C-alpha cells in the first residue's frame, strides 16, 4: 500500500495526485484532480480514495469547495460524487463504518460547527449533530468507532479543546483539552492513541506532538518533529506516522518526517516532488 497525497497549495491551489511508498522510497505521479484544491481532506473507503472540500485559490478566484471526488487506483480515474450541503475549506474528515464524516471548515467568513455524513453505497450526504464549537483547520481521527474533533480555529481563538462524537447517540462531548493550542495540526490515530502533530498556536508554527490516551483521558507529549509545520498532511502507514509538507511561517515544506512509536523518534524519510501546504492524505 502507498501514501496518496492530493491537492495542496504553492502559489495557487494544486491538482497534484502523487503516491509515496515506505519500501522503495519512490514517488509516483498519478491522475490530476479535475479541479485544483487546497485545504481539503483525504480518506479511503473500500479501496477508493476520496477528496473532500477545500477551495480553489487561483489567480482568478478563491472558491470554497463543497465537492466530493473519488479516485479508483484500479482505474486511475477521478469520479465526482454528490456534493456536501455547504462548502468546507480547511475541513476535517474521519471514516466510521464505511461512512465519511465531514467536520467544520469555512465558507467565506462562516466558520462551521456543522457536521455531515456520506454513504458511498448510496452516494448521498446528510446532516448529523453539530459540534459544540466552530472549528476550521480542525484535526479529526477515529478511535474505536468514536470520532474526535481536535483543535482548530473558531474565527478569533485558536483552540486546544477537543470533542468526541458518539455515532450510536449523535451527541458531541467535550474531552480533556490538549496541552497546546493547535490549529492546522496533523491529527491521526496510531495504536490506541489520538496524535496531534504540529499546527499553529496563533504565534508560532509548532514541532511538538502530543497523544491522547482514551483510557486515562490524558494528553502526553512525545518526541517533537524536526521542522515546525502547520497545514500538513498526515497518515498512518505500517504502524508509523508520516507527516507531509505544510507551512512553517515562510516556506512551503517538501519535508516528510516519519515517527516510530517503539523508538519515539522522527526521521526524515523523503521529500515531496515540490513543497506545498494543505494537502489531503490517505493510504490504500
Amino acid at each position: 500500500r502507498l501514501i496518496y497525497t492530493a491537492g495542496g497549495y504553492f502559489r495557487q491551489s494544486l491538482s497534484y495526485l502523487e503516491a509515496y511508498n515506505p519500501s522503495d522510497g519512490t514517488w509516483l505521479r498519478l491522475a490530476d484532480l479535475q479541479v485544483p484544491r487546497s485545504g481539503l481532506a483525504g480518506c479511503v473507503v473500500g479501496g477508493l480514495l476520496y477528496a473532500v472540500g477545500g477551495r480553489n485559490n487561483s489567480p482568478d478566484g478563491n472558491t470554497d469547495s463543497s465537492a466530493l471526488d473519488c479516485y479508483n487506483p484500479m482505474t486511475n480515474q477521478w469520479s465526482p460524487c454528490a456534493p456536501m450541503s455547504v462548502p468546507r475549506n480547511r475541513i476535517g474528515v474521519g471514516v466510521i463504518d464505511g461512512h465519511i464524516y465531514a467536520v467544520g471548515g469555512s465558507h467565506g467568513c462562516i466558520h462551521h460547527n456543522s457536521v455531515e455524513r456520506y454513504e458511498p453505497e448510496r452516494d448521498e450526504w446528510h446532516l448529523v449533530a453539530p459540534m459544540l464549537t466552530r472549528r476550521i483547520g480542525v484535526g479529526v481521527a477515529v478511535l474505536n468507532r468514536l470520532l474526535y474533533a481536535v483543535g482548530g480555529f473558531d474565527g478569533t481563538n485558536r483552540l486546544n479543546s477537543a470533542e468526541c462524537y458518539y455515532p450510536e447517540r449523535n451527541e458531541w462531548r467535550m474531552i480533556t483539552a490538549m496541552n497546546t493550542i493547535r490549529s492546522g495540526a496533523g491529527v491521526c490515530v496510531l495504536h490506541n492513541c489520538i496524535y496531534a502533530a504540529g499546527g499553529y498556536d496563533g504565534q508560532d508554527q509548532l514541532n511538538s506532538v502530543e497523544r491522547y490516551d482514551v483510557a486515562t483521558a490524558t494528553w502526553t507529549f512525545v518526541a517533537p518533529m524536526k521542522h515546525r509545520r502547520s497545514a500538513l498532511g498526515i497518515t498512518v502507514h505500517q504502524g508509523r506516522i508520516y507527516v507531509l509538507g505544510g507551512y512553517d511561517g515562510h516556506t512551503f515544506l517538501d519535508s516528510v518526517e516519519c515517527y516510530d512509536p517503539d523508538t519515539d523518534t522522527w526521521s526524515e524519510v523523503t521529500r515531496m516532488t515540490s513543497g506545498r501546504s494543505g494537502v489531503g492524505v490517505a493510504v490504500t
Binding site: 497549495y9 491551489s13 487546497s38 485545504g39 485559490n57 480547511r90 483547520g137 480555529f153 490549529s183 492546522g184 499553529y200 502547520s230 497545514a231 507551512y247 511561517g249 512551503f252 501546504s277 494543505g278
Partner: peptide
C-alpha cells in the same frame, strides 16, 4: 497571507 496555511488571502 494566511499565517497558518500560507495561502494568499
Amino acid at each position: 497571507l494566511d499565517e497558518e496555511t500560507g495561502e494568499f488571502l
